[PDB]
Design a binder for this molecule. Structure first.
Ligand SMILES: [Mg+2]
Ligand SMILES: [Mg+2]
Lengths: 256, 256
């Protein structure tokens, strides 16, 4: 079994902690006087950027807090406007948060050795990826194929992007594919796609941590946190959790 | 739970017995003083209309009468000339075979009442499906979505055409979908698609009869004749087999 692996981008292979979009989601909302936590603004991470914005205006607190200031819930105009602001800020600093996360490369290197194809589903737009891919390639990492919510009719909770990878790589049986990701969104996407869903933790968005505070964080603590991210993935569709790409192969191994 | 049903065209919903092509081939060869029969025409089943002429070209008996005529043996030219003097003849007589099979119209309505999105895949090229379809619609039959080998890379044996219906009808698990067909290769497409596969028999193709050797074929013979088709099916990978489109809902029911 297993003829192909499909990787999330920002959080699984590139951008540790998935930080590019973070402050921005918070920024646009703060200019309106709403203010949300780095937590909420990271719940629906995985979705098509605009959907991600739309989801933020829909959470009760946010959606309520909003009403308390404008005396009415958020309009398309608003969100549509908020996205336009997001679109240019994120677009400007997007080049930085783009270097591959410490580990992957060797793993892909290994995976391609046993003749395994590498696909790639993502939350960024086509216009965005153009960027993230060039530099990500320049730093070594060029999956065999890339899909975006533009290529298909719908965002990410749907398998749609995955199908296009399978169609492109040329692997028939949906259950001959591993889906590695770092968010709740991916879990579903993998399960809905009918694939083996693996979910990395350290570097993920879930855990949501950099380094000078993971590699410089108190044992228990961190272990206690990994343990919180691990459950979320499992209790959200996920057949296996991992603490990093090094442990991936072994999972494939066990899928026998 | 069964959410969608991908129906095949010729043999399943239109052209009872699938005779559209059978006549064209017998026709193109007739011209070139090379008489071929209904079985030794049917015999090289499925394949790409082009590579079919190719097959028929290698039928010992055909390659022998051919050489008796032109004193050579078919060439890359002849094949082309043939697959070309094929399409035009098809386009010209194809509407006579886009008449919905007695049964199917009345059944689609019933799935429709249950909220089951209707899809379909095929072998006929877009150039042809457009014709066949247009007539079919004009006669009360029109699936929610259509797909031709052209809509995707590789042809039929692969799951690509189902992955695209699913994507368009909007149904998640491939296994919340039933694929109904009238051929061996039709079963493969479903299994590979990873969806419950069903085979319809009296609509021929694998059977090869018409209403005058079915509607009037002797009992002990028709049956002895049916069982063989039912077996070829079960062998090539179908989960179920129904003598008619009617049972289809009893099966969807059994599957639940
Ligand atoms: Mg991520
Ligand atoms: Mg057929």
């Amino acid at each position: 079994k297993i003829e192909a692996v499909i990787f999330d981008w920002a959080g699984t292979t590139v951008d540790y902690g998935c930080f590019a979009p973070l402050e921005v989601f918070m920024e646009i909302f703060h200019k309106r006087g709403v203010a949300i936590t780095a937590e909420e603004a990271r719940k629906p991470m995985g979705l098509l950027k605009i959907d991600h914005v739309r989801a933020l205006t829909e959470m009760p607190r946010i959606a309520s807090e909003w009403n308390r200031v404008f005396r009415q819930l958020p309009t398309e105009a608003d969100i549509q406007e908020m996205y336009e602001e997001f679109e240019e800020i994120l677009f400007a600093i997007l080049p930085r948060y783009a270097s591959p996360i410490n580990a992957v490369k060797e793993v892909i290197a290994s995976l391609r050795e046993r003749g395994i194809k590498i696909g790639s589903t993502t939350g960024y737009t086509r216009e965005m990826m153009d960027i993230v891919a060039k530099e990500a390639a320049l730093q070594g990492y060029k999956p065999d194929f890339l899909v975006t919510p533009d290529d298909v009719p719908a965002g990410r909770p749907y398998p749609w992007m995955c199908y296009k990878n399978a169609m492109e790589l040329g692997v028939y049986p949906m259950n001959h594919m591993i889906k590695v990701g770092d968010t709740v969104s991916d879990m579903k996407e993998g399960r809905n796609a009918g694939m083996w869903t693996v979910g990395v933790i350290l570097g993920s968005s879930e855990l949501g941590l950099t380094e000078e505070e993971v590699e410089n964080m108190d044992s228990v603590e961190l272990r206690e946190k990994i343990e919180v991210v691990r459950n979320r993935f499992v209790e959200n569709g996920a057949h296996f959790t991992i603490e990093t790409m090094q442990e991936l192969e072994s999972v494939m191994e066990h899928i026998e």
